């Protein structure tokens, strides 16, 4: 690099007003309020519960960044970005940036990053009093909003999972930590012979049962509560782990994998789908994954993992890493068989 | 071919980890530790306070963004960007990103933005126990760091301000809120005949005195501790206000302008130098001002203002805009005659 070019780049990297301007505006629902068109701030302020001047300055920053239009001085309207932040929108980003919701709430840990660097462990407890898992369950309004957002990331990738694994030698699949079963449902209806089991929390499995448990795939699907840290429900010959391990530190990730290897048995399989970090540089979306990693370090005790970090945890649960397949959308799909022949 | 992917733009704008990875790593002196070449994480971890795993992961992100190189796993080296983060550097960014210093410290307010929209006022007090000026004054070390940070900024701008106003009509200038006096130092030495007075806090002006009070221009400067909300030293004919009004809400900013009118009298002059906001905006100039304006909302109770918002204020302090020029680097210089 050189000087002026490095300067301009650093100024992008160092901005904290924008991302919070964005988060706040999403929480107040300015994207919805301008969906049908341009409004002036007086109306946006009065509708949002915000001081006109305060909101104006916030929206002006966000207009300069291209989130809204500002055709005439104090009037603001929708753009392609603002549309992604609407509640309407099918692939909406509201739940990831709504501060009343759970996910964006954890992002406040950014200001305690130095403490996170001292102790190593997360700083969600430092920010809000409780670690992340406790105060989700302590207020199930957030606990149901979390499941709603995780339901959305499942949808995104569900097709790619069912396509990318062979199911020829499988009878009964178990979506361990599958949420509302978005991925399970997609596999079962795509492979009609198969049976299935959804394992997750007490309310979350019932909410999955609700949305499709009387449908033709839902008939072939057990909906079983209880923690994946306890002994898993039986009769599975394949356990499915989709974007579950990155939520957990190495000890707790090892437990779950042990429970999966225990439950699937000698001739069975454990099927892992994560987005894996590469040995430096990576490709496109290595920057985003390392960003995510930091959220996972600060909020949760968890961690985005390399193939070999996955291999170590698999090994310590007496599994080997077999076929290592990549989906078009960046997911790595790995078949874990029993370690020894 | 075209930066048209809205989803990517949004993901760019929403990143909150990079800017704090950056602030942390600058706080921990890592750019300095790698100035002389590659270091591996274990060393960097030891020399700073940090856990090796956490620091690896934080540097990994910043390396992804080009701040540091990582040529083999777990080792990070310097770059053109890291140079600008060194204390070393003539135009260093360290004092703006060091969480030990008060400027970057203020950036923690970002997370209380919803309250800033509810109340309208700053959220430094909610972050830190006290508003910005009270705990800067209650912690002298922060005070000094702030002063040091502003001094670097004033140093860069000082030649424009000397060259920007016509000092022919002026015998004695008072730099009101001029920090350690970097602009006054330059203004005085450019115009050998002038007398001068720096007005700021006591420890601040004292730091100014020790820095350049011995020089020829220093000998023509009265280093004067005090508050620009109190009556100013009597009988300077011009009062200078360089990036002071943007720190203050409308009511407080007005009180300073009146205090400036008093001390110069009728047909005295009040010389203002701010970066004013421009309706209809633009690229990097405009966006940066809008970013800074949120810092001013959240840390101070301040505002970036237009030429005419500033006319409103001057008008209510018994002053009228006499001449408006722009420095050749965007700083608008306005002379006000006392009406």
CA dist B324 and A37 (Å) reads 38
Strand residue runs (E) in chain A: 39-40, 75-76, 172-176, 195-199, 221-224, 238-242, 269-274, 319-326, 332-338
Rg (CA), chain A: 22
Q: What string of DSSP letters covers B114-177? A: HHHHHHSS--HHHHHSS-HHHHHHH-HHHHHHHHHHHHHHHHHHHHHHHHHS--TT-SEEEEET
Collapsed DSSP state (helix, strand, coil) of residue A176: strand
Q: Which residue pairs, CB below 8 angstroms and at least 24 apart, start in A219-222?
A: A220/A188, A220/A194, A220/A195, A220/A196, A221/A181, A221/A184, A221/A185, A221/A188, A221/A195, A221/A196, A221/A197, A222/A196, A222/A197, A222/A198
B113: left (phi over 0), alpha (psi -120 to 50) or beta: alpha
Identify whether residues A126 and A239 lie together within a single domain.
no
Identify whether residues B209 and B168 lie together within a single domain.
yes
The partner residue sitting opposite B110, judged by closest CB among A20, A28, A280, is A20
Minimal C-alpha gap between A339 and chain B (Å)? 28
Angle, helices A17-28/B6-14, rounded to nearest 10 degrees: 110
The partner residue sitting opposite A84, judged by closest CB among B6, B93, B119, is B6
Count A/B contacts: CB-CB distance under 8 Å: 201
Give burial (CB, 10 Å; 0-12/13-18/19+) of B1: exposed
- Domain-terminating residue out of B73, B99, B125: B99
Contact A81/B at CB under 8 A: yes
CA dist A20 and B294 (Å) reads 10
Report the DSSP beta bridge partners of residue A216.
none
* Token digits of residue B186: 């330059």
* Token digits of residue B257: 């302008």
A168 is annotated as contributing to ligand binding: no
Strand A39-40 vs strand A75-76: parallel, antiparallel, or unpaired?
A: antiparallel
Catalytic (active site) residue B246: yes
A259 Cβ contact list (under 8 Å, min separation 6): A176, A228, A229, A230, A231, A232
Please tell me the experimental approach by which this structure was elucidated: X-ray
Helix spans in chain B (H): 6-14, 18-27, 30-33, 41-47, 52-64, 80-84, 94-97, 102-106, 113-119, 124-128, 132-138, 140-164, 182-190, 202-212, 216-219, 250-264, 284-298, 307-315
Q: Which residue has the tokens 């190495």?
A: A250
Contact B279/A at CB under 8 A: yes
Collapsed DSSP state (helix, strand, coil) of residue A147: helix
A139 is annotated as contributing to ligand binding: no
Angle, helices A307-316/A250-264, rounded to nearest 10 degrees: 60
Identify whether residues A8 and A46 lie together within a single domain.
yes
CA dist A30 and A46 (Å) reads 11
CA dist B11 and A88 (Å) reads 19
Active site residues of A: 246
Identify whether residues B156 and B57 lie together within a single domain.
no
Contact A19/B at CB under 8 A: yes
Q: To probe the interface with A, which of B6, B12, B15, B302 has the most A CB atoms within 10 Å?
A: B15
CA dist A9 and B192 (Å) reads 41
Resolution of the coordinates, Å:
2.7
Identify whether residues A320 and A217 lie together within a single domain.
yes
Q: Which residues of B touch A118 (CB under 8 A)?
A: 49-51
CB B242 within 8 A of CB B154: yes
**CATH number, residue B11:** 1.10.10.10
Identify whether residues A123 and A141 lie together within a single domain.
yes
* Token digits of residue A134: 């406790």
CB A81 within 8 A of CB A67: yes
**Residue A231: CB atoms within 10 Å:** 11
Helix (H) or strand (E) holding A46: helix A41-48
Nearest to A275 by CA among A336, A200, A337, A326: A326
Strand residue runs (E) in A220-298: 221-224, 238-242, 269-274
CA dist B20 and A95 (Å) reads 22
CB A325 within 8 A of CB B85: no
CA dist A237 and A246 (Å) reads 24
Q: Which domain holds residue A237?
A: 151-275+302-341
Identify whether residues B177 and B129 lie together within a single domain.
no
Nearest to A249 by CA among A175, A305, A308: A305
CA dist B57 and B73 (Å) reads 11
CA dist A10 and A337 (Å) reads 46
Identify whether residues B164 and B311 lie together within a single domain.
yes
CA dist B117 and B115 (Å) reads 5
* Token digits of residue B131: 């508003």
* First CA to last CA distance, chain A: 53
Minimal C-alpha gap between B58 and chain A (Å)? 7
- The phi, psi pair for B18, rounded to 5°, reads -45, -55
**CATH number, residue A118:** 1.10.287.1350
- Is there a contact between A51 and B117 if contact means CB atoms under 8 Å apart? yes
**Residue B202: CB atoms within 10 Å:** 12
Identify whether residues B233 and B308 lie together within a single domain.
yes
Collapsed DSSP state (helix, strand, coil) of residue B40: strand
Residues recorded for chain A: 341
- Is there a contact between A61 and B290 if contact means CB atoms under 8 Å apart? yes
How many domains would you assign to chain B? 3
Contact B37/A at CB under 8 A: no
**CATH number, residue B233:** 3.40.50.150
Q: To probe the interface with A, which of B10, B40, B91 has the most A CB atoms within 10 Å?
A: B10
CB A59 within 8 A of CB A112: no
Nearest to A112 by CA among B132, B139, B110: B110
Q: Which residues of B touch A61 (CB under 8 A)?
A: 287, 290-291, 293-294
CA dist B34 and A43 (Å) reads 52
Identify whether residues A87 and A120 lie together within a single domain.
no
Identify whether residues A55 and A172 lie together within a single domain.
no
Identify whether residues A30 and A107 lie together within a single domain.
no
CB B319 within 8 A of CB B310: no
Contact B230/A at CB under 8 A: no
Nearest to A198 by CA among A172, A170, A179, A219: A179
CA dist B178 and B153 (Å) reads 11
Contact B58/A at CB under 8 A: yes
CA dist B173 and B235 (Å) reads 9
Going from the C-alpha of B253 to that of each of A240, B123, B292, B339, the distances in angstroms are: 63, 19, 18, 18
Query: Dihedral, CA atoms, B23, B29, B35, B37, nearest 10 degrees?
Result: -100
Question: Using the 8-state DSSP alphabet, how is residue A77 labeled?
Answer: B
Q: Which residue has the tokens 């009062």?
A: B239
């Amino acid at each position: 690099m050189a000087d002026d070019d490095a300067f301009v780049h650093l100024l992008r990297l160092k901005d904290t007003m924008t991302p919070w301007a964005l988060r706040a505006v999403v929480t107040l629902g300015v994207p919805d309020l301008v969906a049908e068109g341009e409004k002036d701030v007086s109306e946006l302020a009065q509708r949002s519960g915000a001081v006109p001047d305060a909101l104006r300055r916030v929206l002006r920053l966000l207009a300069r960044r291209g989130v809204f239009t500002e055709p005439r001085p104090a009037v603001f309207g929708p753009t392609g970005l603002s549309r992604l932040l609407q509640s309407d929108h099918p692939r909406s980003m509201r739940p990831w940036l709504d501060l009343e919701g759970p996910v964006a709430r954890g992002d406040r840990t950014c200001v305690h990053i130095l403490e996170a660097l001292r102790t190593g462990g997360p700083v969600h407890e430092r920010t809000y009093g409780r670690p992340v898992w406790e105060d989700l369950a302590a207020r199930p309004a957030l606990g149901a909003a979390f499941d709603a957002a995780m339901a959305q990331r499942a949808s995104w990738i569900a097709g790619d999972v069912a396509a990318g694994f062979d199911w020829s030698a499988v009878r009964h699949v178990m979506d361990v930590g599958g949420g509302t079963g978005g991925v399970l449902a997609e596999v079962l209806r795509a492979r009609p012979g198969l049976k299935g089991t959804l394992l997750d929390r007490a309310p979350t499995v019932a909410a999955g049962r609700e949305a499709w448990g009387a449908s033709e795939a839902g008939q072939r699907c057990t909906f079983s509560g209880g923690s994946f840290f306890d002994t898993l429900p039986s009769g599975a010959d394949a356990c499915l782990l989709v974007n579950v391990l990155h939520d957990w530190a190495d000890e707790h990730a090892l437990a779950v994998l042990r429970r999966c290897a225990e439950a699937v048995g000698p001739r069975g399989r454990v099927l892992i789908a994560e987005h894996l970090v590469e040995e430096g540089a990576g490709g496109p979306g290595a920057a985003g994954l390392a960003e995510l990693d930091l959220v996972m370090m600060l909020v949760y005790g968890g961690r985005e993992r390399r193939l070999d970090e996955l291999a170590d945890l698999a090994g310590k649960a007496g599994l080997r890493i077999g076929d290592v397949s990549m989906t078009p959308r960046g997911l790595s799909l790995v078949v874990c068989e029993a370690e020894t022949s």
